[PDB]
Amino acid sequence: ENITQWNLQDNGTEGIQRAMFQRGVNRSLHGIWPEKICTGVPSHLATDTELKAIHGMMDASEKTNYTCCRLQRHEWNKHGWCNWYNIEPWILLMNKTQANLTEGPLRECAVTCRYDRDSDLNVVTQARDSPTPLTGCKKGKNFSFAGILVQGPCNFEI
Ligand SMILES: *[C@@H]1O[C@H](CO)[C@@H](O[C@@H]2O[C@H](CO)[C@@H](O[C@@H]3O[C@H](CO[C@@H]4O[C@H](CO)[C@@H](O)[C@H](O)[C@@H]4O)[C@@H](O)[C@H](O[C@@H]4O[C@H](CO[C@@H]5O[C@H](CO)[C@@H](O)[C@H](O)[C@@H]5O)[C@@H](O)[C@H](O)[C@@H]4O)[C@@H]3O)[C@H](O)[C@H]2NC(C)=O)[C@H](O)[C@H]1NC(C)=O
Ligand SMILES: Nc1ccn([C@@H]2O[C@H](CO)[C@@H](O[P@](=O)(S)OC[C@H]3O[C@@H](n4ccc(=O)[nH]c4=O)[C@H](O)[C@@H]3O)[C@H]2O)c(=O)n1
Ligand SMILES: *[C@@H]1O[C@H](CO)[C@@H](O[C@@H]2O[C@H](CO)[C@@H](O)[C@H](O)[C@H]2NC(C)=O)[C@H](O)[C@H]1NC(C)=O
Ligand SMILES: *[C@@H]1O[C@H](CO)[C@@H](O[C@@H]2O[C@H](CO)[C@@H](O)[C@H](O)[C@H]2NC(C)=O)[C@H](O)[C@H]1NC(C)=O
Ligand SMILES: *[C@@H]1O[C@H](CO)[C@@H](O)[C@H](O)[C@H]1NC(C)=O
Ligand SMILES: *[C@@H]1O[C@H](CO)[C@@H](O)[C@H](O)[C@H]1NC(C)=O
Ligand SMILES: *[C@@H]1O[C@H](CO)[C@@H](O)[C@H](O)[C@H]1NC(C)=O
Numbered sequence: 001e002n003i004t005q006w007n008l009q010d011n012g013t014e015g016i017q018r019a020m021f022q023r024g025v026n027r028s029l030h031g032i033w034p035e036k037i038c039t040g041v042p043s044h045l046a047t048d049t050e051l052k053a054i055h056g057m058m059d060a061s062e063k064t065n066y067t068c069c070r071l072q073r074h075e076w077n078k079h080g081w082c083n084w085y086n087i088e089p090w091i092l093l094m095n096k097t098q099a100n101l102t103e104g105p106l107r108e109c110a111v112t113c114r115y116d117r118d119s120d121l122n123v124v125t126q127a128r129d130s131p132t133p134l135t136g137c138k139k140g141k142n143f144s145f146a147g148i149l150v151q152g153p154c155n156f157e158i
Pocket of ligand 1: 085086088090093
């Protein structure tokens with residue numbers, strides 16, 4: 001039901017993907033998304049200490065040097081509060097999701113690509129745990145998930 005999506009390293013992609021590459025990080029959680037998007041004032045304002053407890057998840061913002069907690073707070077604000085109600089179970093799920101990402105599932109399906117001409121590969125910049133229509137992927141080419149070459153848009157290797 002919930003989509004779990006993450007960023008993957010890619011030196012050719014400006015932003016978190018390049019920062020991940022430079023830091024030797026392969027996979028960094030973007031979010032866990034139920035159907036309902038939260039609107040309005042959150043029931044609880046996520047603190048830095050709470051958001052830092054999602055170990056390994058790098059912020060997509062350069063304003064924190066891709067650390068914490070802009071993306072982490074945006075995730076709680078847009079997808080967290082109205083679905084989980086309390087930050088504690090949401091922090092636990094996000095943290096455990098990220099721990100699996102750092103270690104590894106794999107149930108890894110490409111979401112967005114940067115087609116690299118020099119390698120003739122669809123470099124995956126974001127992936128999720130269920131198949132989805134692709135964006136920026138060249139049809140017929142192979143997929144590179146943080147250096148792992150796969151034939152299709154879905155990767156099953158640890
Ligand atoms: C996919 O994403 C969905 C979110 O869309 C997620 O479901 C949510 O899971 C979280 C748990 O991780 C649920 O949060 C709990 O919700 C309770 C209220 O639930 C009610 O029932 C319905 C569920 O079907 C829901 O629709 C209703 O609106 C309704 O509100 C909270 O009670 C709960 O708090 C937890 O307990 C404490 C409450 O206190 C009790 O008393 C004491 C005193 O503190 C406690 O010690 C005791 O243990 C009691 O529980 C809180 O203080 C505490 O922090 C605690 O953690 C918690 O917030 C949420 O309802 C689910 N939402 C929906 C819409 O289903 C799925 O898990 C996701 N699945 C995967 C696989 O990712
Ligand atoms: N005030 C701010 C500042 C930063 N941020 C977050 O940090 C990113 C960089 O500014 C934003 O990208 P976002 O704006 S969502 O997207 C811009 C670009 O980044 C991409 N992106 C965004 C988030 C993420 O996790 N991974 C990722 O590739 C997105 O696809 C697009 O190409 C947000 O995720 C925010 O939420 N609010
Ligand atoms: C993190 O990874 C583990 C290993 O895949 C997941 O645990 C398995 O989950 C399935 C279904 O829920 C079950 O068959 C087993 O009980 C678990 N197996 C082992 C070996 O632990 C776990 O669900 C993952 N957590 C998150 C948040 O994704
Ligand atoms: C979040 O997940 C991390 C793993 O990235 C947890 O760190 C573990 O902490 C325990 C102590 O409780 C250590 O014994 C384990 O070996 C840890 N693993 C690593 C890699 O550090 C952390 O406990 C979790 N935090 C929350 C709030 O759930
Ligand atoms: C990473 O990207 C920059 C391009 O902005 C480049 O100058 C550098 O050579 C790259 N490093 C590798 C290992 O590809
Ligand atoms: C960003 O963080 C990295 C890695 O921890 C460090 O190498 C770099 O100097 C930082 N950049 C700034 C501008 O502080
Ligand atoms: C990241 O990905 C490569 C390709 O599978 C792997 O060989 C390397 O050990 C990984 N780095 C981390 C930090 O897990």
